[PDB]
Amino acid sequence: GITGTWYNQLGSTFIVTAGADGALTGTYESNAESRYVLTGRYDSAPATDGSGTALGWTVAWKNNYRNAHSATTWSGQYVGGAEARINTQWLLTSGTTEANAWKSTLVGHDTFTKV
Amino acid sequence: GITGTWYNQLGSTFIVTAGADGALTGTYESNAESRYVLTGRYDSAPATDGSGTALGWTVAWKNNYRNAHSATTWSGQYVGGAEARINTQWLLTSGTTEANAWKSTLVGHDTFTKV
Amino acid sequence: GITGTWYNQLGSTFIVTAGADGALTGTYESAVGNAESRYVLTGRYDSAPATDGSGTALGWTVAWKNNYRNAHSATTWSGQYVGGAEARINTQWLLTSGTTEANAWKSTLVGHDTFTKVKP
Amino acid sequence: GITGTWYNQLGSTFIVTAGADGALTGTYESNAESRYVLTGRYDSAPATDGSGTALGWTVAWKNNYRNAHSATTWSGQYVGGAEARINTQWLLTSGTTEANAWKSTLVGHDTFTKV
């Protein structure tokens, strides 16, 4: 259910493989200059009462072409069924000096679908 | 610098290895029954201006003894200096039904040190 | 056009008046949680926003205590109003329950709400 | 416990009156130029178990002299006694265009004391 290609509504696309050990690994494409490594974890033996599957991943925004000095972690759940969704909240953290530490983190949410 | 053993106020311990091209691997404990796998990423080429090093990691709270059907993601930055510390904000998502999604996700923060 | 009656995706109703001094005053009625009947709200908004088509920053608070019950908790919504055809307010919110020191790590929930003047 | 002047480590100062209704009213100072109105709510009947006292408040960052086109909300709790403190998580949202909303909200924490 998780393994595959997921789209948000801003044109972003990620491809993930959900491993039996509970590993999540893939590529987030914000172009080869826009592709980044993702890595995370998921609940590999979820409850079967209609609850969703807890998961999370991280992208550090560096590849072989560019570097944003920042990272995004998404925390959320997979909802199967009808048309599957991954509903998430995210944190974006940027490298800053001590003095700008207070404005280092952005918070948001994102929903991914299989189409 | 990142590589090593870290602690938080509440006495949890996390062991990381920072890979030369941005990977993070390790364990998070709070005894082996409290040991879980972490995985994440970091900026392997941070600014030279005194800024910190962005990073993130995830833990799914399942091991071979336990499953709380939830996962936590930490987004933050490593600050090398007088005292090396990792300053984070985090998100804990639980698997919930669609009716309870609204109360699925906790938010907090955590400071890690090597001491 | 912030003043008025607003609905979120889960059918909660927010009745608010935007005054001249940047004040936000009203009532909230939730469709979920340890809740029943109206709760008092107060907040602030930017009463002289930019012209560039940026939205209007705003915020408000509800403590979940009325004459019928007390959930020992408060939510704050932080967001922006976007005017026009289908007007709307997009928010991220934080819900803090009172806890003892030991349980404080789990005292805050975070979430996102979207309000529209039409009920879903 | 709550009415009076509170200070963060940042320097910022906030003076509040907690009314019997559960109203919070006051000013947030960082000179007139840096003074802003705050309004909020608190639980005027907290449990007795030793649970802190839930509150929140908002400041829109406009006064007669400047306008940042932004608003911050603090969600947190009051913990009384000698080292009485208010612990909060905050959100700061900036008015942005639709294209830019994904980066409109910052998150962080702050701790307020009486000294």
Curated annotation (Swiss-Prot), chains A, B, D:
<feature type="binding site">
    <location>
        <position position="74"/>
    </location>
    <ligand>
        <name>biotin</name>
    </ligand>
</feature>
<feature type="binding site">
    <location>
        <position position="28"/>
    </location>
    <ligand>
        <name>biotin</name>
    </ligand>
</feature>
<comment type="subunit">
    <text>Homotetramer.</text>
</comment>
<feature type="binding site">
    <location>
        <position position="36"/>
    </location>
    <ligand>
        <name>biotin</name>
    </ligand>
</feature>
<feature type="short sequence motif" description="Cell attachment site; atypical">
    <location>
        <begin position="41"/>
        <end position="43"/>
    </location>
</feature>
<protein>
    <recommendedName>
        <fullName>Streptavidin</fullName>
    </recommendedName>
</protein>
<feature type="domain" description="Avidin-like">
    <location>
        <begin position="1"/>
        <end position="115"/>
    </location>
</feature>
<comment type="function">
    <text>The biological function of streptavidin is not known. Forms a strong non-covalent specific complex with biotin (one molecule of biotin per subunit of streptavidin).</text>
</comment>
<keyword id="KW-0964">Secreted</keyword>
<dbReference type="GO" id="GO:0005576">
    <property type="term" value="C:extracellular region"/>
</dbReference>
<keyword id="KW-0092">Biotin</keyword>
<feature type="binding site">
    <location>
        <position position="90"/>
    </location>
    <ligand>
        <name>biotin</name>
    </ligand>
</feature>
<feature type="binding site">
    <location>
        <position position="102"/>
    </location>
    <ligand>
        <name>biotin</name>
    </ligand>
</feature>
<dbReference type="GO" id="GO:0009374">
    <property type="term" value="F:biotin binding"/>
</dbReference>
<keyword id="KW-0732">Signal</keyword>
<comment type="similarity">
    <text>Belongs to the avidin/streptavidin family.</text>
</comment>
